[PDB]
């Protein structure tokens, strides 16, 4: 199927590898991305544990909240990394890494 990745609003930062692959975006995760991933996951796990005590299911609610948090945090980190690579977010480190490449 024919696809197009061009965006209506152009990128305001240098663009490296305009259409990155999934594996490369995942391999571009920085310390901040892992921090926000872990923060979202931990918040979700804690909310699930606290909310499930009254019904009586702490572990099941913990796991459900953990799944929600993992999915949300991973997609947030992927969004940030892809935006940085594609030039929509400040890619201070990306240009430094891929210039010497």
């Amino acid at each position: 199927m024919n696809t197009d990745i061009t965006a209506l609003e152009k990128a305001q930062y240098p663009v490296v590898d305009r259409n990155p692959a999934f594996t490369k975006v995942v391999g571009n995760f920085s310390t901040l991305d892992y921090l926000r991933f872990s923060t979202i996951t931990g918040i979700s796990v804690t909310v699930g544990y606290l909310s499930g005590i009254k019904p009586g299911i702490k572990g099941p609610s913990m796991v459900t909240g953990g799944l929600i948090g993992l999915m949300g945090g991973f997609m947030y980190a992927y969004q940030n990394s892809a935006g940085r690579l594609m030039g929509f977010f400040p890619n201070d480190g990306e240009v430094a890494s891929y210039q010497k490449r």
Partner: peptide, 30 residues
């Protein structure tokens, strides 16, 4: 009696500590 027995409650404590540390780092690193 120097052992916390509830495994599920211990994991919640670990997750809360990780969430607090990650939030602090997020507010500091960015």
């Amino acid at each position: 009696p120097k052992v916390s027995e509830d495994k599920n409650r211990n994991y919640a404590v670990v997750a809360g500590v990780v969430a607090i540390v990650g939030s602090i780092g997020w507010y500091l690193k960015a």
